[PDB]
Design a protein around this motif. Structure first.
Motif, short mmCIF file in Angstrom:
data_model
loop_
_atom_site.label_atom_id
_atom_site.label_comp_id
_atom_site.label_asym_id
_atom_site.label_seq_id
_atom_site.Cartn_x
_atom_site.Cartn_y
_atom_site.Cartn_z
N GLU A 161 0.81 -1.21 0.00
CA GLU A 161 0.00 0.00 0.00
C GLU A 161 0.84 1.27 0.00
O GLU A 161 0.32 2.34 -0.33
N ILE A 162 2.13 1.17 0.35
CA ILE A 162 3.01 2.33 0.34
C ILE A 162 3.98 2.31 -0.84
O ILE A 162 4.68 3.32 -1.07
N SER A 163 4.04 1.22 -1.60
CA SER A 163 4.92 1.15 -2.75
C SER A 163 4.39 2.03 -3.88
O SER A 163 3.26 2.52 -3.85
N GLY A 164 5.22 2.22 -4.90
CA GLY A 164 4.86 3.05 -6.02
C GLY A 164 4.89 4.53 -5.69
O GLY A 164 5.96 5.10 -5.46
N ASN A 165 3.72 5.16 -5.65
CA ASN A 165 3.58 6.57 -5.31
C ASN A 165 2.50 6.70 -4.24
O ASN A 165 1.33 6.95 -4.54
N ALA A 166 2.90 6.51 -2.98
CA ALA A 166 1.97 6.65 -1.86
C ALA A 166 2.51 7.46 -0.69
O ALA A 166 1.71 7.98 0.09
#
Lengths: 237, 130, 217
Positions: free
Chosen positions: B57-62
């Motif tokens: 849920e925090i990976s990528g762009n968060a």
């Protein structure tokens, strides 16, 4: 056709010239005997001695031809150079090391291709020994919040009096994985003050600055490996 | 809820009125960043609110808008391919060893293509492997 | 583990599809880092680039948001690029490594490939077979004029090596201005060794990325 007109210094260890002498700054500096000589392992010796054009190529100052063919000196410059050496290497001992003779000497050959450039090492302050240290003048400019909306960041940091050859800015951030991050912005080399700085521009957006930690351009070079962490609190400028 | 909520402010206003402050987001990273921006707009990020999220849920762009302090559970043995593979191989080896030491070790028929090879001891094999 | 080697082709034709092969082969590739290249060019600055994910977000800048198409090659845990119609300031030293999402900095040495805009035929002209002639006469100090003179091969930003792992005391790369004629006279030099007397030979063997030639003298 080999090398074009490049008003730069020795590109570190893996220089773009096959006539370089030392990867870092020369061991002998202004104050004692400094020898500058290129190398040529090809068919250069035509009709006896080779035709090498010796000139002091200083960054910013136009070079003046002082010794042609490595045997006779050129008029206009006082006779202060030891024009000796034959065969492959042409040694040129520089005893009168003034504020203008400490430049890079490119042995311009006129046998294979006239418009070429030799080697030579730029004489500067030897800050890679145990005598003198390279104090990095850390100066972080505060970026404005309006500029970050367009994608440009004024996070440039000055690195005056750093190591120009081994430019490895070891960031002391809590987590950073990158095999090389340093914006090449070194100015022209000088032997008078040597105030060249590397402007490592880490341009990031507004949302990127929020998750970014305290911007601290900590310099860790071979010359002066001293921990200089300038805690710069980000905010609205 | 449905993915792609635009009126996320009403959700935060409803969660603020209730006594509970355990905000759980486990859908994706886009909705996570959206609710993070919605909480930061009203200055209700961390002030008594529980933020239990995982690494996916925090990976990528968060985390571009979430301040430092978000509890992010890292996926242990979920993405590594250096020691997690060896751990899984060892676990499977121990499992098949304990299964061979027990009963119900009948070899199933050759499960080739174009043939019905339904294993009659399927549930029993799964119960033994459990 | 931790492998940030940039094995991308650093020499392609002008205005040709640059299939930048970034063989990371690290922990995982399923949307964990950014994996973007940095536009470090002497003369100007860079801009905030994008970041790829599991869906293949091939949009870095608004100009090339939909022009390029990054192919997700999950077979070898890497990806290809389709950089078309590249300019001069865009084509610079690429750092297609495991860039952590957040743009914090770096904790390693200086690596990465730098693709050029020179033609393949202009750069490839034949290794200059020059015998290593030891000087053994410019005994001035610790650093003298002695080294290899290999030229007329691939551009400078390649995998520079030595004669089967020779002394590397004081090795450091530095991206400089490339030549348009393709006569890259790259030749590394060491500070302490290869400056002594006798018959110690220090012939260099600069390896190439798309050729892997280490037999030229």
């Amino acid at each position: 056709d080999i090398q074009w007109v490049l008003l730069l210094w020795v590109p570190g260890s893996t220089g773009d010239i096959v006539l370089t002498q030392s990867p870092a700054s020369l061991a002998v500096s202004l104050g004692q005997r400094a020898t500058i000589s290129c190398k040529a392992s090809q068919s250069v010796d035509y009709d006896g001695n080779s035709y090498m054009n010796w000139y002091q190529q200083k960054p910013g100052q136009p070079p003046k031809l002082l010794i042609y063919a490595a045997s006779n000196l050129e008029s206009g410059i006082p006779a202060r150079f030891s024009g000796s050496g034959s065969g492959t290497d042409f040694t040129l001992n520089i005893h009168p090391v003034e504020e203008e003779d400490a430049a890079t000497y490119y042995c311009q050959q006129g046998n294979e291709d006239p418009p070429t450039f030799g080697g030579g090492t730029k004489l500067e302050i030897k800050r890679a020994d145990a005598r003198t240290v390279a104090a990095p003048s850390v100066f972080i400019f505060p970026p404005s919040d309006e500029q970050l909306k367009s994608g440009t960041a004024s996070v440039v940091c000055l690195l005056n009096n750093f190591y120009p050859r081994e430019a490895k800015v070891q960031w002391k951030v809590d987590n950073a994985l990158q095999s090389g991050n340093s914006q090449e912005s070194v100015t022209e080399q000088d032997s008078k003050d040597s105030t060249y700085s590397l402007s490592s521009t880490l341009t990031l957006s507004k949302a990127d600055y929020e998750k970014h930690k305290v911007y601290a351009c900590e310099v860790t070079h071979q010359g002066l490996s001293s921990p200089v962490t300038k805690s710069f609190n980000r905010g609205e400028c | 809820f449905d993915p792609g909520t635009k009126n996320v402010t009403a959700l935060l206003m409803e969660a603020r009125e209730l006594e509970a402050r355990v905000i759980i987001l486990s859908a994706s990273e886009d909705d996570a960043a959206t609710v993070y921006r919605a909480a930061a707009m009203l200055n209700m990020t961390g002030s008594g609110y529980v933020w239990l999220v995982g690494e996916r849920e925090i990976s990528g762009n968060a985390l571009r808008y979430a301040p430092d302090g978000i509890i992010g559970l890292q996926l242990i043995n979920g993405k590594n391919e250096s020691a997690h593979i060896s751990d899984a191989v060892g676990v499977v080896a121990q499992a098949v060893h304990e299964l061979l030491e027990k009963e119900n070790i009948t070899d199933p028929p050759r499960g080739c293509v174009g043939n019905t090879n339904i294993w009659k001891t399927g549930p029993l094999f799964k119960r033994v492997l459990m | 583990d931790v492998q940030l080697q940039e094995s991308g082709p650093g020499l392609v034709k002008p205005s040709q599809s640059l299939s930048l092969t970034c063989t990371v082969t690290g922990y995982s590739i399923t949307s964990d880092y950014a994996w973007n290249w940095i536009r470090q060019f002497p003369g100007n600055k860079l801009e905030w680039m994008g970041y790829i994910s599991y869906s293949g977000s091939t949009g870095y800048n608004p100009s090339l948001k939909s022009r390029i198409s990054i192919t997700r090659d999950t077979s070898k845990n890497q990806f290809f690029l389709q950089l078309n119609s590249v300019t001069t300031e865009d084509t610079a030293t690429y750092y297609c490594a495991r860039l952590y999402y957040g743009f914090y900095g770096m904790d390693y040495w200086g690596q990465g490939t730098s693709v050029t805009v020179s033609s393949a035929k202009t750069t490839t002209k034949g290794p200059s077979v020059f015998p290593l002639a030891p000087s053994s006469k410019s005994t001035s100090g610790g650093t003298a004029a002695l080294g290899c003179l290999v030229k007329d091969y691939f551009p400078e930003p390649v995998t520079v090596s030595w004669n089967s792992g020779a002394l590397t005391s004081g090795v450091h790369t530095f991206p400089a201005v490339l030549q348009s004629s393709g006569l890259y006279s790259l030749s590394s030099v060491v500070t302490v060794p290869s400056s002594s007397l006798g018959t110690q030979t220090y012939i260099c063997n600069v390896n190439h990325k798309p050729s892997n030639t280490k037999v030229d003298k």
